[PDB]
Write a protein that binds this ligand. Structure first.
Ligand SMILES: CCCCCCCCCCCC(=O)O
Ligand SMILES: CCCCCCCCCCCC(=O)O
Lengths: 285, 254, 214, 17, 285, 54, 254, 17
């Protein structure tokens, strides 16, 4: 009955863990302690096979290690920065009145490393926006922002009041000072059945052809502007984009990243430094 | 007897008398694409026995100095009989594989190989900067790549040779999370991996994308006393399984 | 929350082999422990191999490690890495050892888990008073020691803490590494770790095992 | 569970499996 | 029927008190007025045993002395202070752009004394945040704060825009000026079955080993930053953390603290002063 | 109010002797009155004792 | 597979991959004392898993010169964990044992040990006259005694070292009438004896009386060609079984 | 009593005992 699944869900008891059964001394030709790891299978041996156990009613649950629990938390994926101007000519320009950001999960290591535990992932994305407009003068002025999602092949804005900001077909969300953090869902939007966290392939046959997950699905661009025209007092605006996966599926688990990331969409790990090589978290003894 | 295997694929048969079972990657046996998951509407060609047969790749010598080897699939089979021709004449293909890795020795040799099949083994560069690994380097064909310690070359398109970082910035000790077996010379003389088709699309360009990488890394070096054979071959035999192709066209030329 | 794409139909979910529903499925897979972890070995496959050889003295130590899953050297194993995304852990651990000598080589080892309160065992005689396996090396090349969950509290911290520490594994020669002629008098062992059926992780956190600068 | 929006993607976290 | 328990709950009549029964003169070998306190039991004697009582229908209820009533009220547990800077280098630093606070119920005496009436306590915690940003210049600027809970062993921020603030796995809550007081629940989070208010034990066998409740469960750290980059006019920010216990259980009642607290997680009571000794609230006569 | 730890399962509640449900259970226990409370006695057990003599 | 054994006793587990079955001495499995045979009326303590577990004794080296070894029970365990403490704090005890004797070698070593458990192994003196073997000599603890050919000492309290006379005036060729196994290096790497409590009284003083003697004698000397390991360890692991103690008192001090 | 959140801990004060 669905009420049992609801009660288990509010208790976080959906994913029950086996009890420890009582065991006793054994003298047998069966040797659970011995196996062949050469098979590629992990030994099935459990505590009851190798020590005399008591009965324990196991209270633990695995709900918080579900992939929905593990990946389904909001983390920063972009910091989008622009510095407004009192000059009408400069306020129209990129980096001043508006900024663009090529969408990916690749720029922030905390999120990137978690999703890269899997080869393929499929999820809907909850986006939440945290804007902080640092006043450089004696007043904030009126702060109204527009965030426009520009899909691949749609025209990207080149000016703060370009025709593209009309948003006649693109999704836009508006934010003004004192408004709660903007939030919207992007449904799972790949042309494939899952996102590639990794892709051992190319966009072509040639020396110049691109390699890796960047080939597989262009994710479009977030464009942000201040909607307000030029104002007396400048603002250093930073919009932080937070992403939570929802309705998550993940396939083909991978070793975690063991060394610093160097570049987006690349497994490259060799640093630029000539004295310092790539560093692991294995401590010597 | 659980030590024995015979695998018959088309007109090809492989035997081993010292196996350690076989691994079916992710517990899924290979099969043909179903209408529910298909997108390409053309009737696929299923070349069956002429394609789904063992091809033996170029053999490599395991020495006390060896660092490892790898091959890419389907790339390692691109020159291999009717399977190879079908890859060059069709826009799309899909296949599973049986990989059989062969390495006999004596009761007096020591050594450990991990034999792993990695899906989407996106390689790191051997050089600093954002320069990605070149197409010709990840497409070595049936020769595969031999890993060399402290290898010197000017070519910034070459892949990492750091087998301890899986050639990709992840630790070798965690490689067992992928479908794998070991060849431990005291235990077994072969490893067998059965690989389903694994991809986020139901079929793909065979020449543009390697779905699987076969990685063979000596973890415990080859050791044997004087009078024993000091280097032993590693031989890889691979059979396509349930191979399918669609979108026939003129042959690709590099 | 409202969809930004209000009539969009996502691409069909096709069957893909290897779906993961829970991180404990990954913790239940053996991964190699970098037990050797000396300065000479941490840039190489050699960190995963423990040296065995014919001893002149009886009952010598082979290796030791702390058992706490996110402590060194366990930290960079898959179970240690996944555990370091969580604040608490519980349940039993399986340590597996694969002998990589020749088929002509013979060995017994005593592998012991020592609970907290006494430090690391200083001898095989101290170690064998704890939970232990006497492993006979034979046709089956792998043995497993289960570190049973033996704790005052239902959970332990994954971060090192003297109140919460889990104790030690030590390995000792039981008998000796014995070989005939024309056989190397030395060999390697590979050490692995995975979760038993009772193993769990609780309170999710940022990992201490990965950082970003710039 | 009440769904306020016309898209399946708009719903909160899915049930565990 | 659950509607009876609801009606009693809205009237605060759940915990009824006995009526006073009528009594009359008694001449007996039974002597309810006499007992042996040596037994460690409190005498069972009641008013009807020792005076001639009337019938009284007792209207009193004990609902407000329930442990849920007594501990289930929001009290301050921390004041977290940082003073923002217009200098881009100084605004990045601890105490200026951000602050950290080691979580405990130990710093504020009003809450501490109440929970320390018990040896063990188990509850979920409702946290409420009251931020007051004192403007030191002519304008507030844009005030956006991030509060991040850092569990034990997670990396603590060392800089205001450190990678740790990405919050890819940690819980963060954001607050902006004019937003209502942030609130969230922390579930009962000990590795044990209850929190130790007191612990007659050590983390080790040695002279240097820690003693007392600090050993038993590290509670992590609240990290707060201003998300806004450096601004023209400084703010002296104080975040007050209020805690309400919920779903409360308490065990093994204790004498209340009779003398000033001196240190966190310590029963120590001797002050530093050489003229003034430790002071009680027992007045002389 | 929303939980900051959205799938967290608290540690099992074990039986512990001495649960208190109401503060009146504690008020119903005898405690000593410092009746003597002179300046000579308030730093000592003597404040709890009343002198009797012939 | 009849070659394999695993024995789990408390938190201790022993494995062997080359056994020759196990011997249950006199066909009787160990058990607790029943009310019909009991005489001491105090409720016994049954320390169970903390006591009934394998303790590994000090290992000994088998060389081409070795003459044999012995241990006494319960004496060999008097310093061993909670079993040892219970022997020192109680007037009475009773236990059975699992004895596992471990001696691996190669396919190229030769040698034969008899491994025998002797009830009431009352030793002869190494000297003429009626002088009996001294307490300290029959109580060597977990070290046991190593037998030495033609051993020279003035101490008339020392035991016989004549392994060919069972240290007691009876021929070694008849030692197989006692519960025994052999370790024949071509066949097996361990011997396993399960010993019930054997005595003419239902419980006894653990420190005053050794119920069993474990005797290990090389009948066929260790032989191995150059380059093979010239001496091999013998390691003894012993688990109490159904251990019981009664008459608790102050700890005995020697 | 309606519970708006997926966790037992998120509920208001418990019933008296
Ligand atoms: C338009 C709002 C932002 C949408 C974020 C989409 C995140 C998923 C991208 C997956 C591919 C990757 O970058 O690795
Ligand atoms: C992370 C938000 C603050 C959580 C407050 C937890 C309060 C309970 C701590 C109990 C131990 C103690 O400090 O005595």
């Amino acid at each position: 009955n669905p009420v049992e699944n609801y009660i288990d869900s509010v208790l976080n008891e959906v994913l029950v863990v086996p009890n420890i059964q009582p065991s006793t001394s054994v003298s047998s030709h069966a040797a659970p302690a011995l196996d062949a790891a050469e098979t590629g299978h992990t030994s099935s041996v459990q505590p009851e096979d190798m020590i005399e156990t008591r009965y324990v009613i196991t209270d633990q649950t695995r709900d918080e290690t579900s992939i929905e629990s593990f990946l389904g938390r909001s983390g920063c994926i972009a910091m989008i920065e622009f510095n407004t101007s009192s000059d009408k000519t400069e306020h129209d320009k990129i980096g001043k009145g508006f900024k663009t950001w090529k969408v990916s999960l690749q720029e922030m290591a905390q999120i990137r490393r978690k999703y890269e535990l899997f080869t393929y992932t499929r999820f809907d994305s909850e986006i939440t926006i945290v804007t902080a407009a640092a006043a450089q003068g004696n007043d904030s002025g009126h702060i109204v922002l527009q965030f426009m999602y520009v899909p691949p092949g749609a025209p990207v804005p080149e000016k703060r009041d370009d025709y593209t900001w009309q948003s006649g077909t693109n999704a836009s969300v508006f934010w003004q000072e004192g408004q709660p953090y903007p939030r919207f869902t992007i449904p799972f939007m790949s042309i494939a059945s899952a996102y590639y966290m990794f892709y051992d392939g190319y966009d072509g046959d040639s020396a110049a052809s691109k390699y890796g997950s960047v080939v597989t699905n262009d994710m479009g661009t977030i464009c942000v502007r201040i909607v307000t025209s030029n104002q007396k007092h400048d603002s250093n605006i930073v919009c932080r984009i937070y992403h939570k996966a929802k309705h998550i599926k993940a396939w083909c688990p991978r070793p975690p990243r063991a060394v610093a990331y160097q570049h987006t969409h690349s497994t490259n790990y060799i640093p630029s430094n000539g004295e310092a090589t790539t560093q692991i978290k294995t401590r010597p003894d | 007897s659980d030590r024995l295997i015979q695998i018959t694929r088309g007109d090809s048969t492989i035997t081993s008398q010292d196996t350690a079972n076989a691994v079916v990657a992710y517990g899924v046996w290979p099969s043909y694409l179903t209408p529910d998951d298909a997108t390409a509407i053309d009737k696929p060609t299923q070349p069956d026995t002429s394609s789904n047969r063992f091809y033996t790749l170029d053999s490599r010598s395991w020495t006390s100095a060896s660092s490892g080897w790898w091959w890419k699939l389907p790339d390692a089979l691109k020159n291999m009989g009717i399977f190879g021709e079908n890859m060059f004449y069709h826009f799309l293909g899909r296949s599973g594989y049986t990989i059989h890795v062969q390495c006999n020795s004596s009761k007096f040799h020591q050594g450990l190989l991990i034999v792993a099949a990695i899906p989407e083994h996106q390689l790191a560069s051997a050089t600093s900067g954002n320069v990605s690994v070149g197409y010709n380097h990840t497409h070595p064909g049936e020769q595969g790549r031999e890993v060399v310690p402290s290898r010197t070359s000017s070519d910034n398109k070459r892949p990492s040779d750091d087998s301890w970082l899986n050639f990709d910035g992840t630790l070798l000790g965690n490689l067992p999370i992928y479908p794998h077996q070991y060849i431990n010379l005291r235990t077994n003389n072969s490893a067998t991996l059965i690989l389903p088709y694994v991809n986020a699309v139901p079929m793909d360009s065979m020449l543009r994308h390697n779905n699987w990488s076969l990685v063979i890394i000596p973890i415990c070096p080859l050791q044997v006393q004087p009078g024993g054979t000091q280097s032993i071959p590693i031989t890889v035999s691979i059979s396509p399984m349930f191979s399918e192709f669609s979108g026939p066209r003129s042959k690709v030329v590099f | 929350s409202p969809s930004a794409f209000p009539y969009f139909h996502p691409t069909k979910e096709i069957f893909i082999p290897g779906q993961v529903r829970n991180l404990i499925e990954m913790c239940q897979v053996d991964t190699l422990i970098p037990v050797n972890n000396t300065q000479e070995n941490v840039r190489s496959v050699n960190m995963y191999t423990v040296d065995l050889r014919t001893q002149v003295d009886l009952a010598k130590e082979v290796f030791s490690i702390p058992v706490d899953i996110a402590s060194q050297p366990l930290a960079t194993t898959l179970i240690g890495e996944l555990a370091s995304y969580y604040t608490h852990w519980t349940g039993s651990l399986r340590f597996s050892f694969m002998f990589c000598g020749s088929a002509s080589s013979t060995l017994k080892l005593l592998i012991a888990y020592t609970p907290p309160g006494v430090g690391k065992p200083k001898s095989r005689r101290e170690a064998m008073l704890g939970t232990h396996l006497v492993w006979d090396v034979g046709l089956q090349s792998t043995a497993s020691l289960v570190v049973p969950w033996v704790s005052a509290s239902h959970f332990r911290f994954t971060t090192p803490d003297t109140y919460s520490s889990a104790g030690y594994i030590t390995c000792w020669y039981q008998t000796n590494f014995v070989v005939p002629d024309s056989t190397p008098d030395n060999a390697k062992m590979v050490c692995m770790v995975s979760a038993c059926k009772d193993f769990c992780l609780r309170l999710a956190r940022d990992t201490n095992l990965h950082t970003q600068e710039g | 569970n009440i769904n306020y929006f016309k898209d399946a993607a708009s719903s909160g976290a899915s049930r565990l499996d």
